[PDB]
Amino acid sequence: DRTPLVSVLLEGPPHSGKTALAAKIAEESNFPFIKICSPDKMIGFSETAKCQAMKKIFDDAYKSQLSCVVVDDIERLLDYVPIGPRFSNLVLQALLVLLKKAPPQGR
Amino acid sequence: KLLIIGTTSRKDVLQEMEMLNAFSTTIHVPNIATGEQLLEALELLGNFKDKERTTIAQQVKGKKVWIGIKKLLMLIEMSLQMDPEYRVRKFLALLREEGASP
Numbered sequence: 464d465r466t467p468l469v470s471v472l473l474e475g476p477p478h479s480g481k482t483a484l485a486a487k488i489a490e491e492s493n494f495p496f497i498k499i500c501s502p503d504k505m506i507g508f509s510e511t512a513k514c515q516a517m518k519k520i521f522d523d524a525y526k527s528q529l530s531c532v533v534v535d536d537i538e539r540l541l542d543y544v545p546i547g548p549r550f551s552n553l554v555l556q557a558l559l560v561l562l563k564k565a566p567p568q569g570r
Numbered sequence: 571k572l573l574i575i576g577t578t579s580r581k582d583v584l585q586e587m588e589m590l591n592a593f594s595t596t597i598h599v600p601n602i603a604t605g606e607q608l609l610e611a612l613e614l615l616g617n618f619k620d621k622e623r624t625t626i627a628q629q630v631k632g633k634k635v636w637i638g639i640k641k642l643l644m645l646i647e648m649s650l651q652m653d654p655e656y657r658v659r660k661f662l663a664l665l666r667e668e669g670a671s672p
């Protein structure tokens with residue numbers, strides 16, 4: 464009850480099957496609310512559209528009582544590339560903020 | 571079911587961008603690298619006849635080559651515009667000048 468918000472990161476080399484395991488864990492939770500925010504549903508979106516979609520999903524999660532959410536392929540969610548490097552600062556700031564926000568009491 | 575084929579000409583750049591991981595395999599397309607292959611190509615195209623082919627053979631059969639087919643067609647076309655008795659020499663000069671740099 465003292466820690467309403469919890470986070471965890473799955474790490475590994477490529478072609479290891481991280482997404483499958485994450486999905487399986489989420490399925491076994493049996494929580495009322497489950498959602499997956501994959502980058503392949505937002506092909507061609509600019510930065511603002513991505514921010515808004517993520518915000519909407521997280522609000523919907525906030526509405527319910529207890530929830531679990533999955534975020535996969537972070538390095539693709541914010542456009543990373545070794546040359547440069549280059550990426551979207553806006554999305555990084557959005558994620559850094561959202562990871563430290565607690566939902567309304569009792570949830 | 572879907573199949574995707576992709577073409578390129580600079581593998582290393584794609585390697586740096588971390589793109590070769592996406593593809594499932596790779597295939598290599600080579601150039602012409604021997605006198606026999608060049609002579610066979612000429613014969614198939616049939617631009618140069620027997621005596622000219624023999625002359626070209628004696629000139630080139632004892633060396634190595636580095637050229638692409640699409641460039642070979644253009645070289646032949648450029649050569650053909652000269653007079654009937656100068657074509658072979660100009661063709662050989664162009665082939666020499668192109669440079670190999672394997």
Ligand SMILES: Nc1ncnc2c1ncn2[C@@H]1O[C@H](COP(=O)(O)OP(=O)(O)OP(=O)(O)O)[C@@H](O)[C@H]1O
Pocket residue numbers: 476477478479480481482483484
């Ligand atoms: N023991 C296992 N653990 C996880 N996935 C497994 C296992 N055995 C078979 N699979 C299957 O392997 C696939 C897992 O590949 P997946 O795309 O999830 O990996 P990935 O690390 O996300 O790949 P990429 O790094 O390219 O995004 C799925 O089809 C999954 O069902």
